[PDB]
Design a protein around this ligand. Structure first.
Ligand SMILES: O=C(O)c1ccc(-c2nn(C(=O)c3c(Cl)cccc3C(F)(F)F)c3ccc(Cl)cc23)c(OCc2ccc(Cl)cc2)c1
Ligand SMILES: O=C(O)c1ccc(-c2nn(C(=O)c3c(Cl)cccc3C(F)(F)F)c3ccc(Cl)cc23)c(OCc2ccc(Cl)cc2)c1
Lengths: 255, 269
């Protein structure tokens, strides 16, 4: 791998990233900074008017928001799955291995890209047409409030790295091509592709962030953390499932 | 209107997802049904003794939970168990259809509620020939004659599935064709109670365009196969109506039958 191949890979992934996801970090940041104001949900009354205003496809209030998070996450899985097919070499892997990589990767990627939509005060929703405040989400009763706040806690730290969309496109691909997912049949071509993506990410960060020392290592430290965050997350889901309890078809969609 | 390249890309995406979503392809089923090999041969159940031997040899033929029960019920619960698994597989497939998960959540449920039976019949035909049906992921083959001879209302409950399959199979569709066909069925804007008919019809229009092109390229010598296949998607509507009528009648008489909650909810209204 020469620098030319690595820059070509970075640009290929960037181009696909822009086409795959509805709201880029660049567009999200302009909305969060104030550079039409989004509709703000900050309490129960503004939530009621906002689902009238924005027609959330995404009934006690805390559950309604929780189920809105689930609807959006399912959409993100399909967006990530389509993005994965643009990663060079991915569609040539064993079909079972494509499925395994996506199954075990989507949660880490959803957390990562959710950070593009958050600041310390709230989160963009409905392709940036809405903004739900952190204080509102944190204040939800039962375990739902403590279910929402860890997402903000991660995003504030992840966003301190100041990654842009061209960095994130490669980073997300690196996550997908993880050779240690349980049950992979042919680890060799997965790690070979991840080695190319890691080389491209290293060069991208040195060129795009020349003054950010060891940003490559700090970002790998983060992709690491994501493993533990996601495991905390699935555990919190199992606690809710036994405590709160949906049409059987709906259970299948969200399984 | 989308371009030929986009339509071919959609066909390939759906075929890929279909291979990933469904455990036993028509291609694999036909390789088993044709034989000529040693490693793939199924064990054939055609009577009581071979059913007994098959539960010893073979993915349980019939659920072990029903082992104390009369044979017709045991076989029925084997069908329902697999149908429930099919609902789960179809739901997974549906999520891969571009645009499906972006629909109103109520409409997603409604499309699946009304679509799964038609798809199950369609895909069951892949596992059938005129003499029987592959079971246990193709490890077994149960004969049409054995199923038809089941007592009470069960024998005549089984036979219409074969009657449809022989006619559907004469179209000689392959998995790449079926993957688009099944997506067309799911995205039907005429299902009762849909809230947002327009975005569903928009997706089906692209799927129909893709199916039309797929059949012209894959079956260039089969005149008006597209129209013949739409004529089939029609019949399924009445075939499924006969099925649900028979099932509700049988359920009232056979206290030993159980419906999985997933199926139970689908059959309500
Ligand atoms: O646009 C997007 O890219 C996007 C992506 C992720 C989330 C989101 N997921 N999520 C999870 O818990 C979750 C996660 Cl991280 C990973 C896998 C599965 C889950 C699951 F399934 F459990 F849901 C959240 C929890 C809290 C918050 Cl603030 C947000 C989310 C998101 O939420 C917008 C939203 C919020 C409220 C309402 Cl009413 C409507 C939309 C948007
Ligand atoms: O592999 C698969 O994709 C597959 C898919 C569908 C069926 C199957 N469903 N079915 C229905 O009546 C039924 C239908 Cl169509 C739709 C919804 C609900 C029902 C319900 F609940 F009423 F059962 C059948 C009746 C007769 C026959 Cl021959 C087959 C089936 C299937 O049966 C394999 C089998 C046969 C015998 C034994 Cl012992 C074990 C397995 C396989």
């Amino acid at each position: 791998m020469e620098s030319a191949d690595l820059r070509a890979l970075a640009k290929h992934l960037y181009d696909s990233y822009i086409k795959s996801f509805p709201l880029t970090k660049a567009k999200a940041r302009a909305i969060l900074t104030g550079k039409k104001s989004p509709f703000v949900i900050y309490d129960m009354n503004s939530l009621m008017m906002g689902e009238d205003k924005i027609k959330f496809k995404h009934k006690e209030v805390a559950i309604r928001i929780f189920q809105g998070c689930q609807f959006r996450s399912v959409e993100a899985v399909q967006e990530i799955t389509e993005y994965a097919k643009s990663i060079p070499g991915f569609v040539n892997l064993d079909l079972n291995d494509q499925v395994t990589l996506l199954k075990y990767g989507v949660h880490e990627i959803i957390y990562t890209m959710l950070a593009s939509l958050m600041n310390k005060d709230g989160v963009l929703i409905s392709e940036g047409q809405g903004f739900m405040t952190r204080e509102f989400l944190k204040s939800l009763r039962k375990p739902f409030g403590d279910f929402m706040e860890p997402k903000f806690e991660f995003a504030v730290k992840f966003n301190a790295l100041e990654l842009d969309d061209s960095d994130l496109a490669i980073f997300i691909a690196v996550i997908i091509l993880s050779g240690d997912r349980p049950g992979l049949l042919n680890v060799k071509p997965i790690e070979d592709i991840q080695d190319n993506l890691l080389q491209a990410l290293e060069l991208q960060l040195k060129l795009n962030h020349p003054e950010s020392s060891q940003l490559f290592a700090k970002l790998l430290q983060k992709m690491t953390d994501l493993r533990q965050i996601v495991t905390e997350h699935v555990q919190l889901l199992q606690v809710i499932k036994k405590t709160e309890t949906l049409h059987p078809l709906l259970q299948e969609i969200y399984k």
